[PDB]
Amino acid sequence: PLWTWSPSASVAGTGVGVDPEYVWDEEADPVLAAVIDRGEVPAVNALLKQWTRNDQALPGGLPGDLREFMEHARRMPSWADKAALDRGAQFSKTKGIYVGALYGLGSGLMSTAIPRESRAVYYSKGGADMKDRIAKTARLGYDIGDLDAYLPHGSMIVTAVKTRMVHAAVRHLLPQSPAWSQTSGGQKIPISQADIMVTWHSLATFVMRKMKQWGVRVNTADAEAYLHVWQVSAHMLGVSDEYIPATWDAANAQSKQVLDPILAHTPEGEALTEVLLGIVAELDAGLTRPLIGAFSRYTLGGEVGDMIGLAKQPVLERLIATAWPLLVAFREGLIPLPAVPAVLWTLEEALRKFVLLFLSEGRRIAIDIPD
Ligand code: HEM
């Protein structure tokens, strides 16, 4: 379901296509199911913990099927462009407060309105703790934008391959949780490529849309660079090129059809929201529940905020909406200091500390195959 078009708008650009709802990860899935079934997860995790850098040889002692899978998965696509990648990274850094806010509060809360992500995350067993699991898209979205992401001394190739490996492992594990099977609707196997592309629109497409709507200065070169970083990242995550949009016009159209209609409240999503709100409110950021609620509602809009169960705070939301664009125009250098209500500056400081504490200098545990 979800997806109804051909891939002529895609990175691969071809006329034909298989429905991404019924494609998973043909190279990773059986390699990980074997690694899990031979009881090699503890050992593979101790070995992979040593592999932290894009240019590093794989550690010896890996099982042969896994080594082969990994040396192939760490390859950059031939269409990756170094100059665009460096530019997309610079852009992400220069707009760091906006992109960090939008990933951590916008995309991270929107995830709790995406039923399959919420159920998979909620029921997933043996992986990261709940505290880390809930942050996982935002912190990966964040690290995607790093200056070094795809350079030899960076780590995003590492992060993407291990992430791809984790998704493969979950395809073999989640179906054995009766709780996930019973609530899955008709889906036999979790995390379709279609599902991955839903999350992608909740990240890349959403963030670009909101930055342009708020008046962040996004010239055409930067916008395409940011897209490219995201296209290379979808590929490195294991999304086939036939599903990755080629241009912003394609990404925007695909998001209206693939993301918008699947947003929905679930009990599992409700539970995830409370965890995320509690962790964010517990950071030493000054980001209280009222401020998170109002800003997340302004960002996501009222229909998504209602599904999520963020309560409408009409005064605070109106103050934000009337004045946040002035603050943005001021930080972008376009207007003199604006007379805005003082609480906007409070909000802005709370957001900056949030990016700092939750993402920038945040917790980065090693990405482990689940048990
Ligand atoms: C561009 C899309 C996505 C990104 C960037 C992403 C990122 C990540 C990362 C970084 C992890 C590792 C955290 C960890 O387990 O240590 C992970 C694990 C996982 N992801 Fe995703 N993911 C995406 C899509 C999906 C989708 C669509 C689903 C489900 C429908 C999903 C479900 C999970 C699950 C269940 C785990 C294991 C959670 C655990 O640790 O217990 N992800 N993801």
Numbering used by the authors: 32 to 402
Wording from the paper:
The second type of rubber oxygenase has been named latex clearing protein (Lcp). K30 (LcpK30) and G. polyisoprenivorans VH2 (LcpVH2)23, 24 but recently iron was detected in an almost 1:1 stoichiometry in pure preparations of LcpK30 and of LcpRr, and both Lcps were identified as b-type cytochromes. The typical, α-helical tertiary structure identifies LcpK30 as a member of the globin family.
Here we report the three-dimensional structure of LcpK30 in a closed and in an open confirmation. His198 (F13) acts as the proximal axial ligand in LcpK30 and corresponds to His (F8) of GCSGsu according to the haemoglobin nomenclature. Interestingly, distal haem ligation in LcpK30 is not provided by a histidine as in most other globins and many cytochromes, but by a lysine residue (Lys167, E7) that corresponds to (His) E11 in GCSGsu and (His) E7 in haemoglobin. The presence of two axial ligands (His198, Lys167) to the haem iron in LcpK30 prevents the direct binding of dioxygen that is required for the dioxygenase activity of the enzyme and identifies this structure as a closed and inactive form. Although LcpK30 is an extracellular enzyme, this conformational switch may well represent a protective mechanism to avoid the generation of reactive oxygen species from the reduced haem cofactor in the absence of substrate molecules.
